[PDB]
Amino acid sequence: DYVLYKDATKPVEDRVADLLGRMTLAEKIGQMTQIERLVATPDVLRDNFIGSLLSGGGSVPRKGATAKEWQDMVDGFQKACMSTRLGIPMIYGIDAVHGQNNVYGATIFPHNVGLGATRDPYLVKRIGEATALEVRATGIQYAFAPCIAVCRDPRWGRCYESYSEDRRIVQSMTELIPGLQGDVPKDFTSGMPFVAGKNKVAACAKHFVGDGGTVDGINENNTIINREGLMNIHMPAYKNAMDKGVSTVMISYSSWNGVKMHANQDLVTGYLKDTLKFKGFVISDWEGIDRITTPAGSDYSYSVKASILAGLDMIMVPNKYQQFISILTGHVNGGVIPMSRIDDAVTRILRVKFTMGLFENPYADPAMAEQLGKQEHRDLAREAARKSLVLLKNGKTSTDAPLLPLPKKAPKILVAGSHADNLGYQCGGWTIEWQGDTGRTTVGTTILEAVKAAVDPSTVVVFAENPDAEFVKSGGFSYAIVAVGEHPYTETKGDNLNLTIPEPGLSTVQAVCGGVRCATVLISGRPVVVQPLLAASDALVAAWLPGSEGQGVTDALFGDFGFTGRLPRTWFKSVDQLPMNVGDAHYDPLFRLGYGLTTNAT
Ligand SMILES: *[C@@H]1O[C@H](CO)[C@@H](O[C@@H]2O[C@H](CO)[C@@H](O[C@@H]3O[C@H](CO[C@@H]4O[C@H](CO)[C@@H](O)[C@H](O)[C@@H]4O[C@@H]4O[C@H](CO)[C@@H](O)[C@H](O)[C@H]4NC(C)=O)[C@@H](O)[C@H](O)[C@@H]3O)[C@H](O)[C@H]2NC(C)=O)[C@H](O)[C@H]1NC(C)=O
Ligand SMILES: *[C@@H]1O[C@H](CO)[C@@H](O[C@@H]2O[C@H](CO)[C@@H](O[C@@H]3O[C@H](CO)[C@@H](O)[C@H](O)[C@@H]3O)[C@H](O)[C@H]2NC(C)=O)[C@H](O[C@@H]2O[C@@H](C)[C@@H](O)[C@@H](O)[C@@H]2O)[C@H]1NC(C)=O
Numbered sequence: 001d002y003v004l005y006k007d008a009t010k011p012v013e014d015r016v017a018d019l020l021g022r023m024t025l026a027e028k029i030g031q032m033t034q035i036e037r038l039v040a041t042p043d044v045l046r047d048n049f050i051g052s053l054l055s056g057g058g059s060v061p062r063k064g065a066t067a068k069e070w071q072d073m074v075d076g077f078q079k080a081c082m083s084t085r086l087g088i089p090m091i092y093g094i095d096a097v098h099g100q101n102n103v104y105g106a107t108i109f110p111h112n113v114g115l116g117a118t119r120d121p122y123l124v125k126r127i128g129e130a131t132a133l134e135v136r137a138t139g140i141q142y143a144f145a146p147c148i149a150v151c152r153d154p155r156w157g158r159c160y161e162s163y164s165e166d167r168r169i170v171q172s173m174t175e176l177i178p179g180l181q182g183d184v185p186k187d188f189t190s191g192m193p194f195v196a197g198k199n200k201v202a203a204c205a206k207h208f209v210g211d212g213g214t215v216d217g218i219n220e221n222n223t224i225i226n227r228e229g230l231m232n233i234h235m236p237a238y239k240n241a242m243d244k245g246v247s248t249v250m251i252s253y254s255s256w257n258g259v260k261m262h263a264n265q266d267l268v269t270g271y272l273k274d275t276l277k278f279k280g281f282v283i284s285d286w287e288g289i290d291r292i293t294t295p296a297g298s299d300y301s302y303s304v305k306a307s308i309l310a311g312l313d314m315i316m317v318p319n320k321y322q323q324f325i326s327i328l329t330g331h332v333n334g335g336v337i338p339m340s341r342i343d344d345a346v347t348r349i350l351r352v353k354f355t356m357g358l359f360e361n362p363y364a365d366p367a368m369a370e371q372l373g374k375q376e377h378r379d380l381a382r383e384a385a386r387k388s389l390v391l392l393k394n395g396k397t398s399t400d401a402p403l404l405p406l407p408k409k410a411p412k413i414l415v416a417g418s419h420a421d422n423l424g425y426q427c428g429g430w431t432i433e434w435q436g437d438t439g440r441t442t443v444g445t446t447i448l449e450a451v452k453a454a455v456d457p458s459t460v461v462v463f464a465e466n467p468d469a470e471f472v473k474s475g476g477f478s479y480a481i482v483a484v485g486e487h488p489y490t491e492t493k494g495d496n497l498n499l500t501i502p503e504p505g506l507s508t509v510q511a512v513c514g515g516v517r518c519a520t521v522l523i524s525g526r527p528v529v530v531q532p533l534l535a536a537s538d539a540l541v542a543a544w545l546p547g548s549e550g551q552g553v554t555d556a557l558f559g560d561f562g563f564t565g566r567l568p569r570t571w572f573k574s575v576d577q578l579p580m581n582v583g584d585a586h587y588d589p590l591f592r593l594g595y596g597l598t599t600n601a602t
């Protein structure tokens with residue numbers, strides 16, 4: 001027989017319907033299953049008709065694995081899936097959230113909060129473009145990005161993954177989507193999935209919905225807000241994602257008014273699917289269905305029933321696929337979940353796969369391997385890092401000479417602080433490891449290295465991580481650059497009620513600035529208590545989590561470019577003010593949203 005779904009020249013909808021109509025229940029439930037590479041085997045993938053794999057944070061074939069190693073890994077999994085009766089290719093997903101950040105030698109872009117400071121959606125589109133290439137360099141077809149959370153409380157450990165507390169800025173930054181996926185056609189129907197082809201990846205608007213609105217910024221917690229506030233703060237950017245053809249949506253761990261997002265049929269089916277007309281696939285978060293119950297995973301049968309009935313299409317299991325498949329099969333066999341629900345989930349998954357070209361190009365392109373860490377992409381990350389910097393102070397009094405920009409030629413200068421020569425710290429979370437890490441974890445340029453690469457040959461550069469006051473006073477320095485801030489964190493590990501930087505940080509700034517005039521570079525995922533750092537410093541820069549390209553920092557410090565970044569978030573006077581956002585009744589910021597001092601290029 002002629003087999004329509006295998007015919008590349010046929011419309012997606014026709015191919016979807018043709019394939020669906022041939023599939024067994026096992027093959028259907030298989031498509032709905034995403035498993036970790038760590039539990040995947042050729043037999044497992046074949047026998048269970050698995051639809052998707054992922055790497056969680058730090059799930060890598062080897063430390064320091066090359067782009068080709070990643071391709072061979074992904075292709076090995078694909079070969080197994082292609083060997084099934086129907087040969088449905090798997091889609092491989094990864095958190096490429098500021099570059100292809102799990103991968104050694106990948107370009108690491110500034111985290112979202114710093115991107116929000118740039119107010120440059122086209123820069124963000126270009127980052128999406130570069131990121132698609134570096135993800136494809138590793139054979140991967142699907143990035144779990146953008147996080148379009150609107151972080152309404154900086155005590156949240158994922159506040160750095162939010163472009164802004166202002167939904168309008170988050171909305172503008174949805175340009176990451178057509179960067180990652182390609183621009184949609186002129187004719188395009190809002191809510192339809194889209195990926196241009198083999199040089200682009202499927203994107204994922206996450207985490208639906210109100211992940212940034214949890215009480216006390218507690219990760220995965222309850223968002224307590226009326227429908228009006230949900231719809232005008234947390235929802236708007238999902239509609240922009242629909243208009244730009246986002247391929248997938250991941251559901252949030254968080255609850256809305258006490259209802260688990262992973263169990264909310266009204267929002268997932270009633271709103272996302274039936275109102276916004278989303279035609280791509282809906283994916284769970286990692287063990288998201290498990291966490292519907294308390295304790296998590298204590299009634300997995302209910303977890304499966306509630307999530308699948310709510311309208312989720314693909315489950316990021318990610319480990320115990322046998323239990324998931326068995327339980328879902330039982331629920332379908334007993335009529336508790338109807339076939340129509342299974343068929344809808346599989347329709348959407350196949351729609352995305354056929355649309356993106358996956359049946360035509362299921363294997364990696366070895367010619368793409370060299371896209372990883374490509375210097376052009378690093379130049380872009382460097383541009384983004386510079387554009388993200390917010391100058392908060394440039395002179396102690398109105399009558400002082402502005403410290404920045406600093407001269408490249410001076411007899412002797414000091415670089416200091418725990419964050420001055422620490423690549424892992426300047427990248428933050430989701431870099432190499434899930435939680436990020438310390439030190440030289442990848443290819444990059446620290447602030448110290450950037451300083452050495454920038455200054456006149458006659459400029460002596462001294463590094464001291466934590467020098468005492470006497471060392472500085474006795475040093476014969478013209479000025480100092482001192483970099484301090486937060487340690488890398490991700491998700492609940494970053495939840496923080498006091499928002500004060502670890503020591504030594506302030507003490508180093510005080511010891512340094514007390515002896516010579518100083519530019520303080522603050523590395524953080526969010527506003528932190530800053531008055532004491534401000535009081536000590538001649539100039540102070542909020543550099544956020546600028547990524548691998550530390551020369552973006554010195555590009556502004558030394559006046560190659562003027563400072564242009566503006567706060568995408570409110571800077572609070574103290575944590576007991578929180579939550580506190582632009583527009584609030586009792587708004588009393590240290591720095592308002594949109595604040596930023598400027599310099600001009602020298
Ligand atoms: C305000 O609230 C914050 C959030 O609760 C507090 O920060 C957190 O405190 C807890 C409890 O003390 C820390 O948990 C401990 O972590 C120890 C390991 O050391 C850490 O490693 C983590 C990554 O593995 C980092 O994120 C941490 O920052 C810390 O790293 C070290 O920190 C040193 C101090 O500056 C520094 O000298 C080292 O160089 C650095 N090393 C590295 C690898 O970067 C464990 O041994 C303990 O058992 C315990 O679990 C928690 O880590 C910490 N921070 C984060 C980001 O989660 C904060 O204390 C509080 N502030 C005030 C004013 O009270
Ligand atoms: C010295 O420093 C300031 C930097 O703050 C320069 O003025 C600023 O220039 C921006 C772009 O050149 C202005 O445009 C705004 O930003 C976005 C881009 O993200 C634009 O699309 C949008 O239309 C905005 O209006 C910005 O408004 C402006 N800031 C202010 C308040 O003056 C300045 O540049 C010079 O003057 C400005 C007014 C423009 O005419 C520039 O073309 C011109 O270069 C810098 N001075 C010099 C000589 O470089």
Ligand SMILES: *[C@@H]1O[C@H](CO)[C@@H](O[C@@H]2O[C@H](CO)[C@@H](O[C@@H]3O[C@H](CO)[C@@H](O)[C@H](O)[C@@H]3O)[C@H](O)[C@H]2NC(C)=O)[C@H](O)[C@H]1NC(C)=O
Pocket residue numbers: 218220221222255258294295
């Ligand atoms: C939002 O965050 C709060 C604070 O973490 C969550 O409440 C906490 O829920 C856990 C259960 O998952 C409670 O721990 C349990 O306590 C019981 C009672 O003694 C014990 O038997 C268990 O072994 C377990 O340790 C915890 O007490 C509770 N925290 C408090 C004090 O309120 C809340 O559930 C979160 N809400 C959402 C929607 O996620």
Ligand SMILES: CCCCCCCCS[C@@H]1O[C@H](CO)[C@@H](O)[C@H](O)[C@H]1O
Pocket residue numbers: 055056057095144206285286491
């Ligand atoms: C050691 C494992 C401990 C589990 C703790 C919860 C981690 C969930 S993360 C979750 O993972 C997805 C894929 O990795 C990301 O896309 C999401 O944005 C993120 O919310």
